[PDB]
Amino acid sequence: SKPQPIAAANWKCNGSQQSLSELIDLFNSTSINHDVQCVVASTFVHLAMTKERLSHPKFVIAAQNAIAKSGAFTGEVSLPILKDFGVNWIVLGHSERRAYYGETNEIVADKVAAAVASGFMVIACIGETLQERESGRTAVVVLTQIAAIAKKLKKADWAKVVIAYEPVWAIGTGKVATPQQAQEAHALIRSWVSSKIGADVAGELRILYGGSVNGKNARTLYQQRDVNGFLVGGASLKPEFVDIIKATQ
Amino acid sequence: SKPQPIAAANWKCNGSQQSLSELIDLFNSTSINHDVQCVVASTFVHLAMTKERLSHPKFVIAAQNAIAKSGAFTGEVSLPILKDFGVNWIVLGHSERRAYYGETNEIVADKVAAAVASGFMVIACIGETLQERESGRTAVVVLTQIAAIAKKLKKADWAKVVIAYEPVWAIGTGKVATPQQAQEAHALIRSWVSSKIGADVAGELRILYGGSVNGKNARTLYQQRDVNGFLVGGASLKPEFVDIIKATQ
């Protein structure tokens, strides 16, 4: 058996009033008759609008980032503000932030923990680069990332947690990830959770696949024992997302 | 004579639905009978709401930050998105971003230039740290910042530009800035614009003061020859802002 799946749309830095409206209408009209949690992560700018027009009950909205505390951080957005706005989902430590915005294992760790403390559901991202993969350090590295996070969490916290595996080594590297490789990375994280936190925590823990997923590969990927879902980029701005949600049956 | 003044509210990482609503109502009810441009920079989260409820015609809204292009920058916000949302003002290269978020003279420069190209009005921030001030490098440093920006601009671009002087050396340093010192920094920037771009550009160019301004010091500060306004922090979340706008007559 699997825990409930998650199909998450990571819109990243994209979207227009018009496009998003249209995209959101498609969703509201879609039939989803299964155990599935659909998540929509739009930009800070569009939360308001998403919040309002997204009415299909199998969907929640989420932020793409946040900082922990409110204050003198011009440009930034705090958890406190989100929660007041009414946002309960959030994506933290995505590869792009890790790469461009100076997010270390510890900054991430810290954010997650705040998020968890304020009662958010967290999609926490981890994954290794090509250098790391090529030298055979996948295990070494992801476990290091997961550990940094778990270090700050209590057993009960895990229930609010979702891990997303990002095969960075295969992202813009001209390198291609296969389902089996996905499965192998996921089986690692799960093994770690099991042996370190509890087979109880491990078995309800959702692990999302966050490499390239489209309407074509989605099925084969979800068919894997340890994949519970997806954190989707590109495809999630197209109607093809709908196909991916269905891939989760 | 002076160019039209600007009273800008930099809300930074603060605010709640309720607070901001109340704060915004005060504004809508205020009498402003003079040449003044009031600017309100709320978080990405609250733009929507500000946009909607702020109805006093002497007010515009602005963003606190942005990146240049849309794309795969999870967490971030592009100019393209703002413009579509209907935002035409923006604060760029604030001391806090320079300090915590890795913004160099060139990143700033680049952002400004994009912003300008897309038709935004830009409040561009510059200022030196205590080390810099103490060693006598104020002139050296600010001119370096302004230059990095001007490097990318055409003469016509200046019309969309607003410079804000941030006396960082005096921000959380237990060091205190006086009006005369403000005036001296502003006179420098102006001298530079004059001699390098044109006395024409210099004389219409608005230079905002962006250190600590409250309802008490506001007057003495604006009375200075080269101060055209303010980029306000703390006080701008209180009703005292209204007092500062009036300080601009």
Swiss-Prot record, chains A, B:
Entry annotation: catalytic residues? 94, 166
Pathways involved: Carbohydrate biosynthesis; gluconeogenesis; Carbohydrate degradation; glycolysis; D-glyceraldehyde 3-phosphate from glycerone phosphate: step 1/1
Instruction: Name a GO CC annotation attached to this entry.
Output: cytosol
Residue positions annotated to bind substrate are 10, 12
Molecular function per GO? triose-phosphate isomerase activity
Protein name per its UniProtKB record: Triosephosphate isomerase, glycosomal
Catalytic reaction equation(s): D-glyceraldehyde 3-phosphate = dihydroxyacetone phosphate
Question: Where does the record say this protein resides?
Answer: Glycosome
Q: Which organism is it from?
A: Trypanosoma brucei brucei
